Amino acid sequence: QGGLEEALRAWLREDLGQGDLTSLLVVPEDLEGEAVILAKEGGVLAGLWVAERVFALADPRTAFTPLVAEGARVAEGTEVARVRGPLRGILAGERLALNLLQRLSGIATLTRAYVEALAGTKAQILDTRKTTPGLRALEKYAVRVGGGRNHRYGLFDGILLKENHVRAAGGVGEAVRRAKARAPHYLKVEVEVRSLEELEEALEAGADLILLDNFPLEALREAVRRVGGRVPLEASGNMTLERAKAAAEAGVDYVSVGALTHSAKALDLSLLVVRP
Amino acid sequence: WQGGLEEALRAWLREDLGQGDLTSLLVVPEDLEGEAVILAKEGGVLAGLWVAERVFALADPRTAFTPLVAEGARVAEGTEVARVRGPLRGILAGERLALNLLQRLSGIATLTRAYVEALAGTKAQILDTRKTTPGLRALEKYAVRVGGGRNHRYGLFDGILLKENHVRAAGGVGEAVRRAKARAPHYLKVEVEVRSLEELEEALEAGADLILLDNFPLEALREAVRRVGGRVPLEASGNMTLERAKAAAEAGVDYVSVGALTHSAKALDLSLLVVRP
Amino acid sequence: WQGGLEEALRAWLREDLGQGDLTSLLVVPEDLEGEAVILAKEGGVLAGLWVAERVFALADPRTAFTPLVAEGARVAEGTEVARVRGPLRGILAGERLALNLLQRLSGIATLTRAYVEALAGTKAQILDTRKTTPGLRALEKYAVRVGGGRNHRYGLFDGILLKENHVRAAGGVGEAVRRAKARAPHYLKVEVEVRSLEELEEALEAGADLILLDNFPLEALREAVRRVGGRVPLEASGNMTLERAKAAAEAGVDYVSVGALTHSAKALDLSLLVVRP
Amino acid sequence: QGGLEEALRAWLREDLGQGDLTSLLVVPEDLEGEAVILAKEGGVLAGLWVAERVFALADPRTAFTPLVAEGARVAEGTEVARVRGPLRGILAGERLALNLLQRLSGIATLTRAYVEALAGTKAQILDTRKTTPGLRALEKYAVRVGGGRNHRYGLFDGILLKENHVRAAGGVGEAVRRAKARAPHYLKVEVEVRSLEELEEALEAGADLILLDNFPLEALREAVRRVGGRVPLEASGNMTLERAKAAAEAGVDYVSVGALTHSAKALDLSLLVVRP
Amino acid sequence: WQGGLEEALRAWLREDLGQGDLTSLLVVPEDLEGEAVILAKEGGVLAGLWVAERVFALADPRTAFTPLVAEGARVAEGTEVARVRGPLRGILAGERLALNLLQRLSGIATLTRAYVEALAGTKAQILDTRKTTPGLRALEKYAVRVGGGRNHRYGLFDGILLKENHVRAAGGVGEAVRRAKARAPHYLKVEVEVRSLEELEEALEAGADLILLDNFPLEALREAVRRVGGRVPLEASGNMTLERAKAAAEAGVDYVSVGALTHSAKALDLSLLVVRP
Amino acid sequence: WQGGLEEALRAWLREDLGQGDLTSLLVVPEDLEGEAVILAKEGGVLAGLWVAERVFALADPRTAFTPLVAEGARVAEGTEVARVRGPLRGILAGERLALNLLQRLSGIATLTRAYVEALAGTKAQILDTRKTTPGLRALEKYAVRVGGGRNHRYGLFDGILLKENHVRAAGGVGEAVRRAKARAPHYLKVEVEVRSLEELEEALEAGADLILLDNFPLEALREAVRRVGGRVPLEASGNMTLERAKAAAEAGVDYVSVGALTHSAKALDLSLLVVRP
């Protein structure tokens, strides 16, 4: 939780304003109907319960029935869910519900592809902070549905020394030391390194976690060897399915992927009313 | 601007900052000054420059955001689009949200401009849709305008648009149109989506003010334009691509609505380069 | 309903209640039950019954609001329109706001119904305006609907209406209309206000979709209708009274916009009668 | 103060939404202009500074210049103010500014009529709680501009035993006593009475203030005589100009008038753009 | 409470929960529902039970709160104040907020009856002040009432109290009291604080309804009641300790406002223990 | 602060001002601007100066706040902490809120260096807890830092801490620590509270990153550090008084979290006196 209810009402208002003028014109007030949400392409479903809430907010008399499980992979033409109740309510919540379902499913679909690519390895997929403003909690949820894990929610709950912090501190060593000197005792100090020398600095300074930023595959393998499992290694930077897989086989423990939320194409879904 | 953006930006910054940027507070001196530039890693259209300016100001009012190009200007790769100088902490605190928005809106403006140019030489205009990001509609519609496109209705409250679901609910295109024309708010035009030339005829004869051709193959599109003969404006939509939008425009439609503009526009590659420290 | 009403009602109750109803807390026992009825002191149209129900519920969820007539029903003097029973404190806490709203909205619905009836026998319909109470527009437009009237645009964001000030700013009626027609959002009709038969001709010839006749004397109104000959819908406005609205309707206009509906409607005389204690 | 700034922004948004589409069409972005606010009937002006703020919120480049003082009585055809700056801004704030100015001026006009009717007496005019939801602070302000005084802002800052409280307590005496027994020491206990007998009860129970509810004129005079200035007397209930005046001449100290805010006709005002 | 307590509680719950109670999500099943009990690991007065119950309801509506002792009742170590049943995650989620409030409010209710019992036997009544916790005034003022005390004004908007800064801003106790008495609402009493009896007189004849004695030496504290003969309520103020308070009550004052009731009142040690699993 | 402190301050100011500061409006001219000075009628550590300055700025932007001593600096009775100049109404309006905060936050900053100085000489560092004032956590946690202390987690969302209720909800210190260590975010350390050394061992080998000793008798408090050899941070918890805290620091613990720093910390006596007029 985190105020989702309030957010959904605000997004519904964004679209509804004073009311759905088109539907009020051609759909009787007491006309009940049924609609089907169809997948227009293959992928993974995420956000079914969110869509249910959207329709409920539009009109509490609506009933949402999923025909697939949350996180299930479906084929093109598959019936995802059925919605029944006052037709005006269904038509009012349709666009918002679909906008959310398509977006979350899109994220879960790409995440699932990355996770499956890492099958056979101990490596886990992580998200990042490259999320849609206002939708972070929902998008982080989508990642979990896809099979991935969540990295920090923001700048307030995790210590991650990035290149800019290293530059400010005058080096990886200084950054890791300034951090471990006054960091919350319940948080681990992670630092990003861009070369094998910085990796050595990080290990020497006492970093709890080390992020290998844009390491070529050969350097990544060498990093894994040198660390010898002493500290967890995270790989990130311009990640693709092939690169995440390679990094995993090379032996890293985590692969954070910006693409999961920064460039995930929405899953094409539609809602079709059942002819009265 | 309408309003509410200020409140939305504060909430989005809060989403990321919470009680504070712990990492920066740990290693970055409060008085350490920062100097950075936002670089375009690829060519494209800039949108949201003033939005990014406001986000940095919310992170720390002492930060100075200086635009180096005009809002809506198309820049080449390597172009420094803005300079930011002030407390490094404030810069690092606002960086993520500022760029996220700048990249998103610029990406929309860039794709929109591509569609606009694809219609060059014709009278057709590009329109947006309601396939927008929850909570970002005002900003995304703004980005479409920056790119040169036009806005269709903001939501369900300011336009009559009989979609396939309304047609199915009313029992037919002519049926839905006649019902709407009989009671529609007098200041709104009655538009209806049609999927065939037969449905097009129903719309025309029932008195539709606007007709949206839904995923018509090129041959049918041309025939629709010929038949209508300018009696009513025609809006083409459905799985648009630059090629299809151009074909529809050359076929003679008046508008081409593109969901992709706000539903699948790739973010523009922009990065914040800290030059000092 | 759109939304926000819940939040608005809470704020309005807070405006009156603050930290609490001191007087009632001083002399009314917490468990003392109350029983009251809302009486119509004069005949009129009821609107806002469900709004009053919600206000009482916000004051105290244990209170039971029971409507005795239908929403929008016209009642005669002495009609008990609703019964409220529950903790007397909660009843006294919500009384003022509940009735204030009930009286206001009922008053609007009552006047609107009077204008609607004045147009009986003609095809003309009554329209509201933007001369509404700040913060109450959604509720007042709702009241107009309850009375039988129609709503014009909600604000400046959902309708193109070239008013006298736009005409003056553009240098003329034909000038303003031609400019608007050239770039107006395609889903909106272009309406323009005119003050003379000459301005009416400018509007017609420039392609206006809608024409609003501003304070036309009866003779001119008739002439305007004859000339237009049904080419475009005509909306009459300006210092409306029941007599003038009826005259305009019999003259042949399609719509009569009435500012008085929401700008000067007298509140309906309704009172809360506590029968016990 | 009390959040007026936030309220004005919300009311502006009520009308503006995504933007003033009509003005954007025919008024150039950089076109500067001037408009005049004219009184279309005689009355008293209230809320000039509020209108100024509305135009400022629409566009801070606008300049508002009053041509009459706040609270001044003007004749039909009088120029109330001039507004200059970006024309789009003026046209965007016009309706809201006028809606507020007309409403507040309407209240101040009727209040001023009541106040002038009481000239020659010590009686003061008071308002009531019959105010427009959300506009109480502004309407109470309008009353002051008109020359009246403010009664309690709500149920939280004043003790007023009404007929319903008397019924609940089992009588005026019991109500006044239950009240004075546990009432805040910084507040006066006022009680409404509807007959000379209840008046006697009130005086006997120790009421600090007594409100004569719908007393015929003859009874009102008798009440003033009996009280002999021992406690302040307030008269209220179906007040008209003539009744307030009579009550004042009869000798009451205060006359609270619901009509000031419950049935005050707005002052007719308009805004006309100066031809470019 | 109709004063927006719900919105406050939700906000305070979010201040603590954020994205979610990570710990409980890691080790506590979503389907596992348990039972807990609130324990008073100390002796004192209980206040805020209904507040705690609404915290749990907001955390998880499926939670069942059962108060075992009446509000305001005095408890001893080990006393089961209440038992909550339902989804264990919801209980662990609202635990900390529910207790911070119960403990805080119980502390005030406990310390207040301290004074009430202290200066008992007399007529003096204990009053609070405005030295409350920002945002918690309503709840804290409620705590005092539960402990047997009474409330002074809720803010600067509902009461007239001329303080030292006012007096010097005006130029004396005399005029300041005159400026106030000259245009003060007719339903409000004018109260002024004085430091010398040259000022107590300068006020008593200035027409003051209430008088506040600031850091009065007791030779004057019990003199003042004598020189006033109980004509206008007397309120003692300053460093009102348990002794200097009961003393004033002995001196005969009508009210004793203790700013320490909420400016230095330790929380009542309370705890929530899971008894199942 | 970028954490929405502005909105909080505005809300707290309204809690006190409401419709307006009646008293000051009655006796203080609108054009009269004076000067005031904040005085510390006690000895302690100052914290919240910038908070007070923003209260005055929000009350009346024309107010000039001038801090005379640095934040966190220790002051003695009579020390002029700061001087404010400008419209006297604005100063009297923000006075009470500015002081409630300055006093409250200064009290925490004062009491915190108490501990910091107390267990000084050792390596132990003072930490806060979640037993903070609802809605004031951010500000209170800040106070601790000013007094020389450090912050523990801000809520249940940014830290893993297995408490007694968790342990029993799971079925032991062992599994609970395993369930957490099994799926805990990779950037977080798992901390668990234990009551017996059969549990300290059941945790140390369960793979815990942090250990919290709850109401440890000191024969075990200084044993535990010995049996841990400083492998995992040690945090002492329970009734941590000034003695039981400095003791733990003597025993060698790494951190001592004092829940009394904000659950029972008296405000630092401060006042604002008008010096002109």
Q: Shortest CA distance to A193 belongs to which of A252, A111, A260, A148? A: A252
Binding residue numbers of A = 95, 128-130, 152, 162, 192, 213, 236-238, 257-259
DSSP tally for chain D: helices H, then strands E: 11, 12
Strand D32-39 relative to strand D79-86: parallel, antiparallel, unpaired?
Answer: antiparallel
Counted across chains B and F, CB pairs separated by less than 8 A come out at: 21
**What span, in angstroms and rounded, lies between the C-alpha atoms of C127 and C145?**
9
3-state secondary structure E99-116: HHHHHHHHHHHHHHHHHH
Taking the Cβ of residue D11 and every Cβ of chain E, the question of whether any pair is shorter than 8 Å is answered with no
Kindly give, in sequence order, each residue whose CB lies less than 8 Å from that of residue B198, ignoring residues fewer than 6 positions away.
Answer: none
Show contacts of A58-64: CB within 8 Å, 24+ apart. Answer: A58/A12, A58/A89, A58/A90, A58/A92, A58/A93, A59/A85, A59/A86, A59/A88, A59/A89, A59/A90, A59/A92, A59/A93, A61/A85, A61/A86, A61/A89, A62/A86, A62/A89, A62/A90, A62/A93
Residue C168, both tokens: 């003056």
Q: Is E258 annotated as a binding residue?
A: yes
Q: Shortest CA distance to A233 belongs to which of A243, A245, A246, A223? A: A223
- Answer yes or no: are the C-beta atoms of E56 and E94 closer than 8 Å: yes
Listing DSSP states for A131-190 in one string gives --TT-HHHHHHHHHHHT-B---SSSSS-EEE-HHHHHHHTSHHHHHHHHHHHS-TTB-EE
Reduced DSSP (H G I as helix, E B as strand, rest coil) percent helix, strand, coil of chain C, to 5: 45, 20, 35
**What span, in angstroms and rounded, lies between the C-alpha atoms of A30 and A88?**
9
E44 φ, ψ to 5°?
A: 170, -165
Between C218-228 and C197-206, two packed helices, what is the crossing angle to 10 degrees? 20
Q: What is the CA radius of gyration of chain A?
A: 23
Residue C147's identity, in one-letter code, is G
Classify domain A1-120+264-276 at the CATH superfamily level: Quinolinate phosphoribosyl transferase, N-terminal domain (3.90.1170.20)
Reduced DSSP (H G I as helix, E B as strand, rest coil) percent helix, strand, coil of chain D, to 5: 45, 20, 35
Task: Identify the three-state secondary structure at position F14.
Answer: helix
Cβ contact (<8 Å) for E169 and F88?
yes
Preceding omega of E277 cis (within 30 degrees of 0): yes
CA E107-E109-E112 angle, 5° bins = 105
Preceding omega of B277 cis (within 30 degrees of 0): yes
Q: Is C110 annotated as a binding residue?
A: no
3-state secondary structure C205-223: HHCCCEEEEECCCHHHHHH
- Answer yes or no: are the C-beta atoms of C38 and C272 closer than 8 Å: yes
Question: Which residues of E are catalytically annotated?
Answer: 96, 131, 163, 193, 214
**What span, in angstroms and rounded, lies between the C-alpha atoms of F274 and E165?**
6
Reading phi first (left if > 0) and then psi (alpha if -120 to 50, else beta), residue D72 is in beta
Preceding omega of C277 cis (within 30 degrees of 0): yes
In the residue annotation, B235 being an active-site residue is answered as no
For A13, A26, A91, C209, C210, the CA distances from A21, given in Å and listed in that order, are: 14, 9, 11, 20, 19
**D23 exposed, middle or buried (CB, 10 Å; 0-12, 13-18, 19+)?**
buried
Give A137→chain E minimum CA distance, Å. Answer: 7
In the residue annotation, F14 being an active-site residue is answered as no
- Least CB–CB distance from B187: residue in C152, C186, C254: C152
For A267, D202, E144, the CA distances from D227, given in Å and listed in that order, are: 81, 11, 38
Please tell me if the domain spanning F1-121+265-277 has the same topology as the one spanning F122-264: no
Preceding omega of F277 cis (within 30 degrees of 0): yes
**What span, in angstroms and rounded, lies between the C-alpha atoms of F206 and F208?**
6
Cβ contact (<8 Å) for B187 and C150?
no
**What span, in angstroms and rounded, lies between the C-alpha atoms of B261 and B25?**
39
Interface test with C, best of A14, A16, A18, A21 (most C CBs within 10 A): A18
Q: Is B123 annotated as a binding residue?
A: no
**What span, in angstroms and rounded, lies between the C-alpha atoms of F253 and A23?**
68
Residue B221, both tokens: 């599109």
- Answer yes or no: are the C-beta atoms of F263 and E267 closer than 8 Å: yes
Fold category of C122-264 in CATH: TIM Barrel (3.20.20)
Task: Identify the three-state secondary structure at position F26.
Answer: helix
CATH class of F1-121+265-277: alpha beta
**B163 exposed, middle or buried (CB, 10 Å; 0-12, 13-18, 19+)?**
buried
Token pair 């471990």 is at which residue? A180
CB contacts of E24 in chain F (<8 Å) are: 156, 166, 169
Reduced DSSP (H G I as helix, E B as strand, rest coil) percent helix, strand, coil of chain E, to 5: 45, 20, 35
- Least CB–CB distance from F154: residue in B13, B19, B93: B19
CB contacts of D170 in chain C (<8 Å) are: 277
Rounded to the nearest 10 degrees, how much is the dihedral formed by the CA atoms of A7, A10, A14, A17? 160
Residue D211 pairs in a beta bridge with D192, D234
Cβ contact (<8 Å) for F263 and E18?
no
Give A188→chain F minimum CA distance, Å. Answer: 5
Question: Which residues of C are catalytically annotated?
Answer: 96, 131, 163, 193, 214
For E27, E84, F162, F179, F216, the CA distances from F169, given in Å and listed in that order, are: 8, 15, 10, 12, 22
Type and span of the H or E element at C227: helix C218-228
Cβ contact (<8 Å) for E18 and A2?
yes
- Answer yes or no: are the C-beta atoms of E82 and E68 closer than 8 Å: yes
Counted across chains E and F, CB pairs separated by less than 8 A come out at: 206
**What span, in angstroms and rounded, lies between the C-alpha atoms of E237 and E243?**
13
DSSP state of C235: E
Beta strands in chain C (DSSP E): 33-40, 44-45, 64-67, 74-75, 80-87, 125-127, 160-162, 190-194, 210-214, 234-237, 255-257, 270-276
Residue E155, both tokens: 């803010």
Taking the Cβ of residue E5 and every Cβ of chain F, the question of whether any pair is shorter than 8 Å is answered with no
DSSP state of D266: P
CB contacts of C19 in chain E (<8 Å) are: 3, 138, 141, 154
**What span, in angstroms and rounded, lies between the C-alpha atoms of F162 and F177?**
7
What residue in F sits closest to B10 (Cα-Cα)? F4
Q: Shortest CA distance to A114 belongs to which of A105, A123, A101? A: A123
Q: Is E239 annotated as a binding residue?
A: yes
Name the structure determination technique.
Answer: X-ray
Q: Which of residues 15-34 of F touch E (CB under 8 A)?
A: 15-24, 26-28, 32, 34
Listing DSSP states for B185-233 in one string gives -TTB-EEEEESSHHHHHHHHHHT-SEEEEES--HHHHHHHHHHHTTSS-
Cβ contact (<8 Å) for B2 and D19?
yes
Residue B3, both tokens: 């309003």
Classify domain D121-263 at the CATH superfamily level: Aldolase class I (3.20.20.70)
DSSP tally for chain A: helices H, then strands E: 11, 12
Strand E270-276 relative to strand C190-194: parallel, antiparallel, unpaired?
Answer: unpaired
Domain limits, chain C: 1-121+265-277, 122-264
Determine the longest span between alpha carbons in chain D, in angstroms. 73
- Answer yes or no: are the C-beta atoms of F62 and E96 closer than 8 Å: no
CB contacts of E88 in chain F (<8 Å) are: 169
Interface test with A, best of C2, C153, C188 (most A CBs within 10 A): C2
Interface test with E, best of D151, D186, D208 (most E CBs within 10 A): D186
